[PDB]
């Protein structure tokens, strides 16, 4: 479980409240559109809690996927 | 909602002297403010009970403060009611 590391560890200083930023947000989703758990995100309680919101917003806007297809099954 | 200039307006209206914030008159005034606003909110939204509990609590607080004021100085009490136009 979470064998590479820390999505937060590799990234710059970024706004968690920017739902309009696809580049940064796409890193917090798995292969499927699923939002990564805390083990993977490396975030904190309210950090994660905010990220979920902004991601869901971006999904509504059409910038991020709700779900994806898995490859090489 | 209740903004800051509104609240400050009512505070400086019922103050007993410049600087007074928490005297009984001012508190009864603020409670009357919040109660009126909230009851207006409950005129529609009849199905919001969780706020209605708040209304009960605010009314309770106002009535206890007024009970105190009536007990202490009946003149300030009559004055307060005549000013706000409560009870009845």
């Amino acid at each position: 479980p979470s064998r590479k590391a820390k999505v937060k560890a590799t990234l710059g200083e970024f706004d968690l409240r920017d739902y309009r930023n696809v580049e940064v947000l796409k890193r917090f989703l798995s292969e499927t559109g699923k939002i990564l758990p805390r083990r993977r995100t490396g975030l904190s309680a309210k950090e994660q809690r905010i990220l979920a919101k902004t991601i869901k917003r971006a999904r509504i806007l059409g910038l991020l996927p709700f779900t994806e297809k898995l490859v090489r099954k | 909602p209740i903004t800051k200039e509104e609240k400050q307006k009512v505070i400086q209206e019922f103050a007993r002297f410049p600087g007074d914030t928490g005297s009984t008159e001012v508190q009864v005034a603020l409670l009357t403010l919040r109660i009126n606003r909230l009851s207006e909110h409950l005129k529609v939204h009849k199905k919001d009970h969780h706020s209605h509990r708040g209304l009960l609590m605010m009314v309770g607080q106002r009535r206890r403060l007024l009970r105190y004021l009536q007990r202490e100085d009946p003149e300030r009490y009559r004055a307060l009611i005549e000013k706000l136009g409560i009870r009845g």
């Binding site: 297809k69 898995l70 490859v71 090489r72 099954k73 | -």
Partner: protein, 119 residues
Amino acid sequence: KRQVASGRAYIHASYNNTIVTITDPDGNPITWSSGGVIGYKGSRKGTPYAAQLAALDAAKKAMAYGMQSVDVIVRGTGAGREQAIRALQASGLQVKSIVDDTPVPHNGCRPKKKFRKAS
């Protein structure tokens, strides 16, 4: 009577059966097969071996249309899902990719009592 030669292969696998459709690039099917398409009738349709036979039958019928390479897409968890994929790779059809498209609701509809303790 097509000459498709490149297409899609849908493996839909439940616990009770495995049905394999093979389609043109636009998704319109060409040939299909299943546990019941081969001899099996009862519970044996949900077998991995029946899944192998189904995949192979479907692929044979597909290469009859002059099919060569397919993109495999899998829906469902059941025995002989993977065995269907394996038969398909071994079929002589070139498998360009495998994908799990298996549908899941995001808490949509009430399941049958068998499937309860879920939503």
